[PDB]
Subunit: 188 residues, 2 copies
């Protein structure tokens, strides 16, 4: 075939029911995740090729960055609850990997405040139970697929993208090959 199991994607031995249509996992400490987001813009390009209605979910993971890793998963939950993902993704990635100015939960908070989120608004969300359940959903989703590495992307809780089976000479071609595979899998 043109799309082979084991080449551009892998089929999960134990499929997951009730999983979001397109689920992406990442970590602000993950180098390749930085490339995918800031340079390649994977998520955006994938979104612009998905059929009408198909929803995309992006979750943060706990297994990198120790203590800060967990703080970031909670911060991501806050970003989701408040709907400010598009305002804090870049400064969080850069804060951790470019300028190395993010070293504690306090530093994470500064980013949100700088990005325009009010202090009291951030603190309320940070301590909310709505955020606590969001953290739990992120953890459960990772558990359902036995995730042990990022970046990762699953389609219909059954297939996992395999970017190792794609050409990386030209970045634009790589991105489109990636996006087309997600489209193919979503209607499969």
């Amino acid at each position: 075939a043109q799309y082979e199991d084991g080449k551009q994607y892998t089929t999960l031995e134990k499929p997951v029911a009730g999983a979001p249509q397109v689920l992406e996992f990442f970590s602000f400490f993950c180098p390749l995740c930085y490339q995918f987001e800031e340079v390649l813009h994977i998520s955006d390009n994938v979104k612009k090729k998905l059929p009408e209605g198909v929803k995309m979910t992006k979750y943060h993971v706990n297994f990198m960055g120790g203590d800060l890793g967990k703080d970031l998963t909670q911060a991501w939950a806050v970003a989701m609850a408040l709907g400010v993902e598009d305002k804090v993704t870049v400064p969080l990635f850069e804060g951790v990997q470019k300028t190395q100015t993010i070293r504690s939960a306090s530093d994470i908070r500064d980013v949100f405040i700088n990005a325009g989120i009010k202090g009291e608004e951030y603190d309320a969300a940070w301590n909310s139970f709505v955020v606590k359940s969001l953290v739990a959903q992120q953890e459960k989703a990772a558990a359902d697929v036995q995730l042990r590495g990022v970046p990762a992307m699953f389609v219909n809780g059954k297939y996992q993208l395999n970017p190792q089976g794609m050409d990386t000479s030209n970045m634009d071609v790589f991105v489109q090959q990636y996006a087309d595979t997600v489209k193919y899998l979503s209607e499969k």
Copy 2:
């Protein structure tokens, strides 16, 4: 300051003979490298405190950015061969990470042409023996020190700077501590 093995620097288990006095590794895809170069000016500050007769060598790595990473390593060789390092370093960092106008080998050529290098000259340099030699040199150098990641700097092939063991609190103090550590190690 007080310099201690395991703290501000590390001693190599297996020393590399013939290594440049001050060897620095980076990648145009590396975020912190971009920071070191344009904001901190780490290299400049290190040069400003190096003794008489001390030369700095800077090499590019392959393990980042897939196949384009290899092309950038060859383009860096061309920059060294033509002696235009100071003219193209920032434009290449911006093209890859900021403006994102560099997506394939062809886009790199444009950077050089825009800086004043004739296309014929760039193309001739690109396929030259001097360049193929420089590319091999950069690859061997990384292999010899078993480079895990970048940015990285080695002194006299025996010591490796450990910025993680340095005072990150104040960037101005950090920069000078980094430079002083290099100076201290060069005469040891």
